[PDB]
C-alpha cells in the first residue's frame, strides 16, 4: 500500500509499505530518505507510539495513513 509520514520539518513524505511490514522496516525506509537512524526515531499514530517489533497490521495502519515523526529529547 501507500502511507504518509509527517516529518520533523512538517513536510509529509510518501512511503511504499505492506501491512505485513514491521515498523523497524518502516523506520528503515524513513532513514532512506530522511537519514534518521531508527533508534533515534519515534513514530506516533492515533496517539500511540509505535513499538518496534510489531507490524502495521497490529496497529491497523491502512492505506493513506499519516504517521508522525518526532525525536527523543532526554532530560
Amino acid at each position: 500500500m501507500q502511507i504518509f509520514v509527517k516529518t520533523l520539518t512538517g513536510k509529509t513524505i510518501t512511503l511504499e509499505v505492506e501491512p505485513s511490514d514491521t515498523i523497524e522496516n518502516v523506520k528503515a525506509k524513513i532513514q532512506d530518505k530522511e537519514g534518521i537512524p531508527p533508534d533515534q526515531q519515534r513514530l506516533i499514530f492515533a496517539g500511540k507510539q509505535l513499538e518496534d517489533g510489531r507490524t502495521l497490521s497490529d496497529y491497523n495502519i491502512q492505506k493513506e495513513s499519516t504517521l508522525h515523526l518526532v525525536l527523543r529529547l532526554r532530560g
Binding site: 520533523l8 510518501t14 496517539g47 499519516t66
Partner: protein, 299 residues
C-alpha cells in the same frame, strides 16, 4: 504559603517529576481520573497515578513536603515501558506511555474518553483532476509542532498555522487519474480535547546529519483561541487557558526538565517546580520560559 509538594529525584527522573507537576495542574484530567477510578469501588495504572496527582494538585500538608513518585515508574517499568530507573528520558514519550496505558485500561463504557483525546482531519485533493479523496480522521493525544526557522518574533500561533497549512505532495496514486500524480494535503482539527497538550519539537535534524537542540524562544499566551484551526464551520467557540509549562534546559544528550504551574486554590499565582524545590514564580517568568510541553484546558 500556597506551595505544592516537591518530588525527589532518584536518578535523572526529572522527566517524570516535571510531567506529574504539569498533569496535576490540569483539573479536568484529575476529575476524569476520579470518575474513571470510581468503578474500582464497585493492579492498575490509574489508581497509582491518581494518588500522586491528588496530592500534587493541593497545597502541601507539611512544611517543605517532598514526595516520591517512583511507585508510578515501577508499574510502568513492569507492564508498559521497559526503561532503566536512572537514564534520562523524554517527558513527552512518558506522556504517551501514560496516555496509552489509560486507553488500554479503559478498553478493558458509559464513561467518556480521557480529556486529552482529540481527532484531526486529513484532506487531500489531486492537483491534476481536482477530485477530493475522502477525508481521514485520526486521533491525537498531543500536538507535536515543528518550530519554523530571521523569524522576527516567534509565536505559538505561527507554529500552529504551520502545522495546519497546506502542502504539496508528489507521487501519490490518484483513483480518478488512476495513474501517480501530485496532491495538496492539509491537516485540520475536528474534535478538540478538553485538555490540550502542545509539544514544541526542540530537536531538529541538521544538514550535516546530527540532532540540533532548538533554543529559540516561542512566544505563547495565557489565553489561546483555537477557532482558526478547526476543520468544520460549527458555531462553538474554542477558548483555552494555560495551566502549566514543562521546560527543558540543556542540549540533546544532557538536560534537565523544569515545570511552571499554577498554584492550587487550597489561581493567578504561579510556581517554579524543579524536582524537590518549589518557588513562587511570576507570570512574567512563566511567559519568558522556553516552552517544551504546554498544557491548556478549555474554558
Amino acid at each position: 504559603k500556597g506551595l505544592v509538594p516537591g518530588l525527589v529525584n532518584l536518578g535523572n527522573t526529572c522527566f517524570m517529576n516535571s510531567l506529574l507537576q504539569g498533569l496535576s495542574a490540569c483539573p479536568a484530567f484529575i476529575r476524569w481520573l476520579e470518575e474513571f477510578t470510581s468503578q474500582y469501588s464497585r493492579q492498575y495504572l490509574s489508581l497509582t497515578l491518581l494518588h500522586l496527582l491528588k496530592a500534587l494538585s493541593c497545597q502541601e500538608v507539611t512544611d517543605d513536603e517532598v514526595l516520591d513518585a517512583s511507585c508510578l515508574l515501577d508499574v510502568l517499568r513492569m507492564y508498559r515501558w521497559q526503561i532503566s530507573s536512572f537514564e534520562e528520558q523524554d517527558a513527552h514519550e512518558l506522556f504517551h506511555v501514560i496516555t496509552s496505558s489509560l486507553e488500554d485500561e479503559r478498553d478493558r463504557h458509559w464513561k467518556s474518553q480521557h480529556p486529552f483525546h482529540g481527532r484531526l482531519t486529513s484532506n487531500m485533493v489531486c492537483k491534476h483532476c481536482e477530485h477530493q479523496s475522502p477525508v481521514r480522521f485520526d486521533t491525537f493525544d498531543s500536538l507535536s509542532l515543528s518550530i519554523p526557522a530571521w523569524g522576527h518574533p516567534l509565536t505559538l500561533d505561527h507554529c500552529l498555522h504551520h502545522f495546519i497549512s497546506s502542502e504539496s505532495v508528489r507521487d501519490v496514486v490518484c483513483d480518478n487519474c488512476t495513474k501517480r500524480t501530485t496532491f495538496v494535503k492539509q491537516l485540520k482539527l475536528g474534535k478538540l480535547p478538553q485538555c490540550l497538550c502542545i509539544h514544541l519539537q526542540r530537536l531538529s535534524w541538521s544538514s550535516h546529519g546530527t540532532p540540533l537542540k532548538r533554543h529559540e524562544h516561542v512566544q505563547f499566551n495565557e489565553d489561546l483561541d483555537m477557532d482558526e484551526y478547526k476543520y468544520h464551520s460549527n458555531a462553538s467557540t474554542y477558548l483555552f487557558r494555560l495551566m502549566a509549562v514543562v521546560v527543558h534546559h540543556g542540549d540533546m544528550h544532557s538536560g534537565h526538565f523544569v515545570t511552571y504551574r499554577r498554584s492550587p486554590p487550597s489561581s493567578n499565582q504561579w510556581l517554579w517546580v524543579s524536582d524537590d524545590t518549589v518557588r513562587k514564580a511570576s507570570l512574567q517568568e512563566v511567559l519568558s520560559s522556553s516552552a517544551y510541553l504546554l498544557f491548556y484546558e478549555r474554558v
